[PDB]
Amino acid sequence: GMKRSGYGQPIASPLSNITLPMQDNNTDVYCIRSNQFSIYVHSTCKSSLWDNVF
Amino acid sequence: GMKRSGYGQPIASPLSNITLPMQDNNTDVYCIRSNQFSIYVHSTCKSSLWDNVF
Ligand SMILES: *[C@@H]1O[C@H](CO)[C@@H](O)[C@H](O)[C@H]1NC(C)=O
Ligand SMILES: *[C@@H]1O[C@H](CO)[C@@H](O)[C@H](O)[C@H]1NC(C)=O
Ligand SMILES: *[C@@H]1O[C@H](CO)[C@@H](O)[C@H](O)[C@H]1NC(C)=O
Ligand SMILES: *[C@@H]1O[C@H](CO)[C@@H](O)[C@H](O)[C@H]1NC(C)=O
Secondary structure, three states: OEOOOOOOOOOEOOOOOOOOOOOOOOOOOOOOOOOOOOOOOOOOOOEOOOOOOO | OEOOOOOOOOOEOOOOOOOOOOOOOOOOOOOOOOOOOOOOOOOOOOEOOOOOOO
């Protein structure tokens, strides 16, 4: 969740969201339960003028 | 404060309570003010189906 400052210094929001795949319903802890695995990271950048709209 | 998950994996609640003896009214910090001491730990296990009833 990127935004902006008076000067214009771009600032990210500690209020950002990390999503792990779904396991045992909770999605706050994902575990690997297989013999092999591959991990990939992807991201989406959203912005706002107003706080928390994105 | 133990409970249960959909699968059944028993889970304890960070919402658990540790009680120290009473000193200077506050019970969040207990100090030893004697020449000798003995410390014992005891516990009670309570459970719930509904959250926070125990
Ligand atoms: C993340 O999701 C929360 C709801 O938990 C939402 O309020 C917030 O705007 C989102 N933050 C992002 C997408 O940066
Ligand atoms: C700094 O904050 C004050 C109070 O919100 C505001 O009046 C002023 O315009 C701000 N100046 C900036 C954004 O540089
Ligand atoms: C601990 O006491 C709190 C009140 O501070 C209560 O709401 C909570 O259910 C108790 N947790 C236990 C006994 O695990
Ligand atoms: C996972 O959570 C959703 C939303 O609360 C619920 O509909 C679903 O039945 C749950 N599945 C479980 C408990 O495995």
